[PDB]
Structure 1
Amino acid sequence: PVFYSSKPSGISNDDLSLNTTRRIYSRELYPNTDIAQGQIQVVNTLDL
């Protein structure tokens, strides 16, 4: 999550917009699933 929340040096906004690097939110994958406010709203994908 450091790549998305506090961009380390050398990482740009383009590096985080690729469909291979971008943050996935649960609303995109599960638009009909309700998450309580303040709970985990991101899908932590396993990337190969």
Structure 2
Amino acid sequence: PVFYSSKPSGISNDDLSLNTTRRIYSRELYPNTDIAQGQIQVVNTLDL
């Protein structure tokens, strides 16, 4: 999450929008799933 919240040096917003590096949210993959406010709202995918 450091790549998404606290923008590190050397990383631009273009590198964070490629569909292979962008953050995945639960509404994108599970639009019909209701998550309590304040809980995890992102899908922590396993990238190979």
Q: TM-score range by the shorter chain?
A: over 0.9
User: How many pairs are equivalent?
Assistant: 48
CA distance in 2, matches of 1:46, 1:35: 21
> Does the residue aligned with 1:4 lie in a helix, a strand or coil?
coil
Higher helix fraction: Structure 1 or Structure 2?
A: 1
TM-score, with structure 1 as normaliser = 0.99
User: Aligned-pair distance for 1:17?
Assistant: 0.1
After TM superposition, the runs of 4+ consecutive aligned structure 1 residues lying more than 6 A away are none
Percent of aligned positions with the same letter in both sequences? 100
User: Aligned-pair distance for 1:12?
Assistant: 0.2
RMSD over aligned Cα, in angstroms?
A: 0.2
> Does the residue aligned with 1:7 lie in a helix, a strand or coil?
coil
TM-score, with structure 2 as normaliser = 0.99
In the alignment, which residue of structure 2 is the partner of 1:15? Answer: 15
